[PDB]
Structures are given as C-alpha cells and as structure tokens.
Design a binder for this molecule. Sequence first.
Ligand code: HEM
Ligand code: HEM
Lengths: 145, 145
Amino acid sequence: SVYDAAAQLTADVKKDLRDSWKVIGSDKKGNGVALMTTLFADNQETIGYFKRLGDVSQGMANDKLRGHSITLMYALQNFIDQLDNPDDLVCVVEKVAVNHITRKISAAEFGKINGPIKKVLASKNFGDKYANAWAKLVAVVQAAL
Amino acid sequence: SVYDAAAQLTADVKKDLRDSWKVIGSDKKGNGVALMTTLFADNQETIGYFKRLGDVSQGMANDKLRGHSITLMYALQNFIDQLDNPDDLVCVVEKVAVNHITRKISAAEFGKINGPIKKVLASKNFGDKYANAWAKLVAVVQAAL
Ligand code: HEM
Ligand code: HEM
C-alpha cells in the first residue's frame, strides 16, 4: 500500500531528502524548469502529454511552463514537509496521484522523472546516495498509481 | 486584467500579507481544513463542486479533504513567495485559475472564499485590515477567471 511505502522511509533517507531539498528547493523556478526541460530532452515521448503548456522548447520564456514548473516544486515541498507523518504524506501523495491517473500516466511512466531528478541533483553535487533517496520518495507516489 | 490586479499589491499590502501568513501558514493542515469547513458551512451551495472529496462534513477525519486542504495552503504559500516578481506571480495565478475554469468556477463564486479567510484570520487576532489585504490577492485570481 501507499502507507507501507511511506512508513518505509527511514530516518537516514529523510535526512538525505531534507538536506538535498534545502538546496534544490531554494530556487524553485530555476530548478523546476530545469527538471521539466531535462525530462523533455531525455524522454521526448512525454512531450505530447503537456500540450496545454504550448511550445515547451521555449523554456523559461514560456509562462505556462514556468507556472507549471514552479507549482510542481511546491508539490515536492509539500511532500518534504509531511515526511514525519505518514498519514499526512499519504493523503497529499494520493492527491497528486489522482491528477496523474486522470491523465493516463502509469506508475512506470511516472518513474521517468528519476532520470531528470538525478541530473538536477548532480548539478549541485548530490551523488547517487541522494538520487536513490529521491527514487524512494517517487516510489511512494508510484504505489498509488 | 490580471496584470492590473497584480499592480494593486502595493508595499503595504504585501507586508500585511507576509506578516499574517507567517501565522496562518504555520499550520497548513489545521487552518487549511478550517478554511474549507467554513466555506462549506457558510456557503452550502458550493459543496456540490467538491463531489470527489466525499462527505466533507467529516472535516479533518476525511482523508481526501485533508489532502486537498493542505495542498490548497501550498498554493497560497506559492503566491506569497512570488510577491517579489509580478511576472512569476501571474503565471502561477493563471495556473491555479485554469484548475478552476475547468470546474466551471466563476470569479464571483471564487470570491466566496473571502468570507472564510476573514473568519480564519479573525480567530488569530488579525482584523479587517488583513482581510482586505488578502481580498486583493484573491482579486488577482478572480481577474484570470
Ligand atoms: C516528481 C514527480 C512529479 C510531480 C511531483 C508532479 C506534479 C504535478 C503537478 C503538481 C501537476 C499539476 C496538477 C494540476 O493542477 O492539474 C502536474 C501535472 C501533470 N503532470 Fe506531473 N508530476 C510529476 C511527474 C510527472 C511525469 C513523470 C509525467 C509524465 C510522464 C507527468 C505528467 C503530468 C501531466 C500530463 C500533467 C498535466 C499538465 C497540464 O496539462 O497542465 N508528471 N504534475
Ligand atoms: C484562496 C482561494 C482558493 C485557492 C488558492 C484554491 C486552490 C485550489 C487548488 C490548488 C486546488 C487543487 C487543484 C487540483 O489538483 O485539481 C483546488 C481545487 C478545487 N477548487 Fe479551489 N481554491 C480556492 C478557492 C475555491 C473556491 C472558492 C471554490 C469554489 C466555490 C473552489 C473550487 C475548487 C474545486 C471544485 C476544486 C476541485 C476539487 C477536487 O475535485 O479535487 N476553489 N483549489
């Protein structure tokens, strides 16, 4: 269950999540857009899903993409803040899950975000240990998809 | 015009928004649910729009309502954090606007949130001065609906 996946996040994992978020979460506009642009660059097959955003190749100049990217970073902020209470983490995770289920996004497709996250983390010198921690958090959402 | 509305956020208004947010934003779960339950209580005609959340009268005990409420508070956190740059504030406001336009929510009905905000602020000892400040921020979203 989603609860099982959340309850499985250890103190060490939460520590790495919080430490890395202190940095990548400090520039939501910059890192948020970087995350989306990396997703489109390495997984071009996902571009079609974001037609509402218009031409995503415009990057920062695209107001719809910028608004989307910043908002996505607050969803992650939400997750990070609820880490110590699995009950609260689960209900916010399920909220995000529903928004993607309605778009026909499978658990496997949702996991495509791990690549971009790893690269963005690496840009700030956060290695594999941190990428693995984030994959565990993403896995919590996948449990609901 | 969302841009003209955003221009109404003067130095004094922004200060009042930040000062009051430091208090109400400290407990997103509690105040988030308080806002929603107040909305449903004072404006029963809006409950129909929230069919997905199930029995909203259950308040905090309703997992979907709690998840929804916390997420809403992060939308406000988003707005507050973008007060420095009007171009960024506008793109995140339009993002939220789209989510309501699709649910057929008009500017007039969106404005029904002012009552709840006024009451929640009042319970924390923040009077009309602050309620009016928030009314102006809500007005920015209304301009995009
Ligand atoms: C870190 C993981 C992710 C998070 C936290 C996340 C978060 C979000 C949020 C908050 C929204 C806005 C929901 C709304 O207002 O309707 C959104 C929309 C969306 N997401 Fe994700 N997402 C993630 C990964 C993905 C991935 C990997 C895909 C695709 C393979 C995806 C596809 C979509 C689509 C299609 C939309 C709708 C965009 C639109 O039309 O406005 N998401 N996501
Ligand atoms: C401070 C004002 C408000 C803010 C910042 C706000 C923010 C949000 C956010 C972020 C969501 C989640 C979007 C999603 O993931 O689909 C949402 C959903 C929604 N909002 Fe609002 N909202 C506000 C006022 C209102 C009002 C006054 C109404 C109606 C009278 C309304 C009706 C809805 C509905 C119907 C949903 C969909 C709920 C669901 O089915 O899950 N909102 N709102």
